[PDB]
Design an enzyme around this catalytic site. Structure first.
Site, PDB file in Angstrom:
ATOM      1  N   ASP A  98       0.811  -1.211   0.000  1.00  0.00           N
ATOM      2  CA  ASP A  98       0.000   0.000   0.000  1.00  0.00           C
ATOM      3  C   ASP A  98       0.848   1.266   0.000  1.00  0.00           C
ATOM      4  OD1 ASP A  98      -1.830   2.009   0.344  1.00  0.00           O
ATOM      5  OD2 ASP A  98      -2.685   1.183   2.198  1.00  0.00           O
ATOM      6  N   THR A  99       1.110   1.772  -1.195  1.00  0.00           N
ATOM      7  CA  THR A  99       1.873   3.006  -1.360  1.00  0.00           C
ATOM      8  C   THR A  99       1.195   4.280  -0.825  1.00  0.00           C
ATOM      9  OG1 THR A  99       0.983   3.407  -3.573  1.00  0.00           O
ATOM     10  CG2 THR A  99       2.997   1.974  -3.383  1.00  0.00           C
ATOM     11  N   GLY A 100      -0.106   4.184  -0.553  1.00  0.00           N
ATOM     12  CA  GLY A 100      -0.875   5.285   0.012  1.00  0.00           C
ATOM     13  C   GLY A 100      -0.832   5.372   1.529  1.00  0.00           C
TER      14      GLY A 100
END
EC number: 3.4.23.16
Lengths: 4, 99, 99
Positions: free
Chosen positions: B25-27
């Site tokens: 999850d890059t967010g």
């Protein structure tokens, strides 16, 4: 802190 | 590996001797796992998501193997809808986004 | 391009004649944009994540350009703290995770  | 995004980027991690599935999850600034026991000291923390803020337990310097790659860093545990691997450990395994 | 994850992966997008910054989010199934008065038919929706659910407006077939790469699909509009590019558009621009 911020996790979307 | 190279992971495309037509499906959720779900992988197996090992943490505290146990296998779990987690979303790459890059967010997410941080790595947040659903309720679980981890060894050692923790401190209360609050984090924000899309729906508002939650209370988590913060464990520092936790080893986590992610898709065979080693990270050691902060793991937050609390009421997240899915286990997420955030940028704090993504950077350790040398993860980038490419298009 | 290649985007490292030391920082939030914020990129410029163009939607509805507006230039915005938006977070490339491999953890998001959907694309959720800060409150904006887009024209067009919409349908109400609830989406969740850490902290629970927010109410949003679903717009279909919206052209969105992401770092010069064109895409078109569903955008959700509501009180998100940040513009989020989810997998529905990330797949159209050819975006992968790599480690």
């Amino acid at each position: 802190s911020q996790n979307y | 590996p190279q992971i495309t995004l037509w499906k959720r980027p779900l992988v197996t991690i090992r943490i505290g001797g146990q296998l779990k599935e987690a979303l790459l999850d890059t967010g997410a600034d941080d790595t947040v796992l659903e309720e679980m026991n981890l060894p050692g000291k923790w401190k209360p923390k609050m984090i924000g998501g899309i729906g508002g803020f939650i209370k988590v337990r913060q464990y520092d310097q936790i080893p986590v193997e992610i898709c065979g790659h080693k990270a050691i860093g902060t793991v937050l545990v609390g009421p997240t809808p899915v286990n997420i691997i955030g940028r704090n450990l993504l950077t350790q395994i040398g993860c980038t986004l490419n298009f």
